[PDB]
């Protein structure tokens, strides 16, 4: 059965961008999925997306602009101390010049660059570049 | 027995109120009837 909604959604987006599609449909939706997409959109990696209501878990349609190379989830959600950001950047990112690691902290869901500014650790959710 | 006693007491309490304190509102229906019956003017 399906055990992770976030992992399912990120696999659908990465698969569609590999095939050069313009839109992708994601089902089911969740609060964590929407927050993850808002971080990607703020940095300019996807574009506009829309949520459709069906009185159950919703559906999401995402528009892709072709700037996203790969996104993925990290399972299980390992803890990350504020001094451990460099270790994760070295392991799962193409370089130290671009790309983001997404964390869930007591201040909310954010990328690793913002978390370093606020000096907070948390649990690693995923990445995109 | 203690559980039964408390249950019986609650039933009496729900019977005292919602039957006596409520349905007392015949006081205001009497006042409303008086207003409609009165004020005949003429």
């Amino acid at each position: 059965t399906m055990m992770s909604v976030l992992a399912n959604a990120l696999r659908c987006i990465a698969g569609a961008e590999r095939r050069g599609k313009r839109q992708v449909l994601i089902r089911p939706s969740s609060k964590v999925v929407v927050k993850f997409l808002q971080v990607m959109q703020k940095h300019g990696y996807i574009g506009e997306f829309e949520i459709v209501d069906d009185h159950r878990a919703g559906k999401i349609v995402v528009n892709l602009n072709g700037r996203l190379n790969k996104c993925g989830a990290i399972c299980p959600r390992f803890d990350c101390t504020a001094r451990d950001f460099e270790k994760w950047v070295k392991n799962i990112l193409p370089s130290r010049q671009f790309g983001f690691v997404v964390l869930t902290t007591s201040l909310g869901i954010m990328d690793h660059e913002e978390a370093r500014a606020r000096n907070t650790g948390g649990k690693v959710l995923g990445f995109f570049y | 027995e203690q559980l039964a006693a408390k249950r019986l007491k609650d039933e009496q309490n729900r019977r005292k109120a919602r039957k006596q304190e409520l349905k007392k509102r015949e006081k205001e229906r009497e006042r409303a009837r008086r207003d409609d019956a009165a004020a005949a003017a003429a």
Binding site: Q23, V24, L25, E50, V52, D54, K59, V61 | -
Partner: protein, 85 residues
């Protein structure tokens, strides 16, 4: 054929052929009918996919036959579909 498909606003033809529960928003396939049997001038509401035994209030005779899918009405009866809302 120059028009491109939008996933959030499907065309009439594309959405018309889809299985229910495969549409963008799932919904029913059935409806209700206003059936008048021959005699007794009575009007009764019948489900389209009715599998139980349906009889008029007075005549106490069968009004439809259960099948796989849509029920079949007795020969003497006529029906009018009722509005959704």
């Amino acid at each position: 054929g120059f028009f491109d498909s939008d996933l959030s606003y499907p065309t009439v033809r594309t959405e018309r052929m889809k299985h229910k529960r495969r549409r963008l928003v799932q919904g029913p396939n059935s409806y209700f009918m206003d059936v008048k049997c021959p005699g007794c001038k009575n009007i009764t509401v019948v489900y389209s996919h009715a599998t139980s035994e349906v009889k008029c209030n007075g005549c106490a005779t069968l009004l439809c036959r259960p099948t796989g899918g849509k029920a079949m009405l007795v020969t003497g009866c006529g029906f009018r579909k009722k509005p959704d809302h």
